[PDB]
Amino acid sequence: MKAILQLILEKRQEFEKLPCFEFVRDETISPEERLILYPCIAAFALNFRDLNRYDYRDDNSSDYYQKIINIHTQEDAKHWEWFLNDLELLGFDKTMRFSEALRFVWSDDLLHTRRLCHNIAVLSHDLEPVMKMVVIEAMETAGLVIFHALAKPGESIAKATRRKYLYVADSHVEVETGHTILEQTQLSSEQEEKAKEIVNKVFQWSTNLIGEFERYVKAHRSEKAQPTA
Template identity: 40%
Template sequence: MKEVLALIQNKKQEFSQLPLFKFMQDQSIDPKQRLAWAPCAAHFIMNFGELNKYFLRVEPTSDPIQAIINKHTYEDDHHWLWFLEDIKNLELDKSLKFSDALKFLWSEETKNARWLNYQLYRYTSQATPIQKIIVIEVTEATGNIMFSIAAEIGKEIKAITQKPCRYFADFHLDVETGHMTGSSGIEQLLQDIQLSEATRQEAFELVENLFTVFTQFTNGLLVYAKTHKIEQPLKAA
């Protein structure tokens, strides 16, 4: 498993160089505009709790790895609540007819968020505990990059508006460590798992596929942020 976790770290470094993160760090752009992609990500963010509850979690279990996964899911299944708070504080909480909101959530602009969800469901629906760990580690790695940058924007916005963020903030970053757990004991346990050559190759392929869909999702967010002014109402093309 050590080689698989090393690959995830290498892919994380590649992921950190995506154009969206340079856009988010550009202080010549209004800080709210640098988070203008947030509505576009809603489908993924709002489904993330259910991924943890219904796909990653298995109870009861006698498998020690699955037990670790279960514990992690309880830490990750409610972050969407913080997202809803920030949508209000960022003044992205636009008034829409219900039919228009549905059109937006299933529009061309948000297709990458939906596709990411579907792929995560696909990879976890019949997954082994090891495969679930890989999904979690990749999700944590990509989230750590995103939230380390978003938290800085959250600080800028708070200084301007006096309204604190929780999702786009250190508050969230503190629980998104970049790994499934901050416990060195569990990290060592994962490192020490022995995989067969066939299982290792399958794991490598899973890591590559997951980073591909996260990259597609992230690139789509940048397109949205560049083409949708934060002052404009949400609208599907």
């Protein structure tokens, strides 16, 4: 189990270095340009809400680990509204045809973004609570890397425009920083092998999402955020 927690740090240290994040943290580039990837998260954020509401959560469970997951899911299932809040603030909540919105979400350029929650649902669907906690810890660690990064230009725009950002914001990183129990557990021989595969898959799928964000920024480099004071 210490190995599993050490692999998660190893992957986070790799994950933290991706070009996307070097770009996002680059105070030499305007924060509006660094948040060009923002509308991309539309293919993920509400899927993530549903992963928490409908896939992770088991309300009827007595399992020690499942009751902790249930509390966690109740928090994480709230963040999609924060995504919609900042979409409007950043000027990305634009008038379009319904079909344009569907074609955007279901773009082949947002495949890995769109299917990250799907892959996690398939991975998790027959795991015991303890093994679900490994899935959630890895996923939560990747999320904290991304939002730590995105809160840099997010908080720069929030200060310059005198508006309260909720998603690409320190307040979002604060709740997810919380997201002392894995430490307090030891895995079967089989469980350790499954755990390593889980951590490897979640970071591989998260890196695939970040790869699409990077390509979108390049392909749509002019489509900067348009916040108003």
